[PDB]
Structures are given as C-alpha cells and as structure tokens.
Amino acid sequence: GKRIDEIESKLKHLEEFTTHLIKLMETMLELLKLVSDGKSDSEEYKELLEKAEEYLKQATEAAKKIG
Amino acid sequence: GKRIDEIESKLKHLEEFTTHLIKLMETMLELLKLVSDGKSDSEEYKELLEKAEEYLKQATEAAKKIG
Amino acid sequence: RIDEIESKLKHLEEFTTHLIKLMETMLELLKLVSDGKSDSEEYKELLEKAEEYLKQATEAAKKI
C-alpha cells in the first residue's frame, strides 16, 4: 500500500507538528499570564518569547515536511 | 488487521484537536485585543484566561489520544 | 476511502499553513507587547491580520 505509506508519513509529520504546536500554545498562555500579572517587560517574558519563537520554527519545519 | 481504521482514528482526533485549537486562538486574540485596550488586569481578562486554559487542556488531551 | 483520507490531509495542510501565519502574527504581537508597544498602529494592523488568518483557519477546518 504505497498510498497508505504516504498517508502514514503525512500523519507522522502532522503528529510532530501538533507536538511543537502544543508546546507553543503553553508558552503563549504563560506569556499572557505574565502580561496579566504585570511583568510585560522582564527576563521571564524574554525567555518565553525566545522559546515560543523556537517552537514556532520547529512547528513550521514539521508542517513543511507534510508537503 | 485494521490499518485504515487507525488512520481514520488519527484523523478524527486531529479534527477535534483543530476545533479546540480554533477556540483557543479566538480566546487568545480577544485577550490580545483587551491588552491593546489596557484591560490586562480586568475580570474579563481572567475569564478569558480560564477559558483559554480549558481549550488548551481539551486540545492537549485530543492530541494525546493520537498515540 | 483513501480518496477521502487524502482530501482530509489536504485540508489539514491548508489548516497548517494558515495556522503558521496566525502563529507568526501572534508572536509578533507578543513582541510588540514587550518593549511597551501595546497601543501602536503596528499592534492594530497585526490584530487585523490575525483576524484574517483566524477566519482562514476556520474555513480550512470546516472542509475537514
């Protein structure tokens, strides 16, 4: 089943994409929480921002692998 | 065995994942609108944060039920 | 059966594209939140682009 293998590969790439996406979503929720507490400009916000950017790049590569 | 059935289960769980994801993204966009208005400490912000956490949990479990 | 799964995967790919666009917009908005630019016009146009990407993602997810 060659078509089955193609579908399996696309689903694998979607799985890793959703993994990085969930990490990015937790990161953005924590960033919004820090905004709520008032620490809009703090080292925690910078670290979370860089982590969200790397998660977005990883998810972008994973979604590029699907096509 | 049941290969295409497993594929269909993955796709169904991904559909639920995308549904909760879109709810979460709407919540996040309203949160950032409130940030632009300066309601980062209001009660509406807290309710939206709670709803976003709920959507994040639902998306997390829906993506966990994919393997 | 297989054609249906392939159509589902195509719609999911469109969803992932619109989703990447929305995520980039949201991260740029969070950057604007830092350094104290929560009121700039860049924030406003980024909110507009985020609404557009969100509606595109909804249309793409309805096709699944």
Residue numbers in the entry:
A (entry chain B), B (entry chain C): 3 to 69
C (entry chain A): 5 to 68
From the manuscript:
Here we use deep network hallucination to generate a wide range of symmetric protein homo-oligomers given only a specification of the number of protomers and the protomer length. Starting from only a choice of chain length L and oligomer valency N (2 for a dimer, 3 for a trimer, etc.), the method carries out a Monte Carlo search in sequence space starting from a random sequence. The loss function guiding the search is computed by inputting N copies of the sequence into the AlphaFold2 (AF2) network, and combining structure prediction confidence metrics (pLDDT; per-residue structural accuracy, and pTM; an estimate of the TM-score) with a measure of cyclic symmetry (the standard deviation of the distances between the center of mass of adjacent protomers within the predicted structure). To eliminate such over-fitting, we generated new sequences for the HAL backbones using the recently developed ProteinMPNN sequence design neural network (accompanying manuscript: Dauparas et al.).
To evaluate design accuracy we attempted crystallization of 19 designs and succeeded in solving crystal structures for seven (three C2s, two C3s and two C4s). All crystal structures had the correct oligomerization state and closely matched the design models (median Cα RMSD of 0.6 Å across all designs, with resolutions ranging from 1.8 to 3.4 Å). The side chain conformations in the crystal structures also closely match those of the design models.
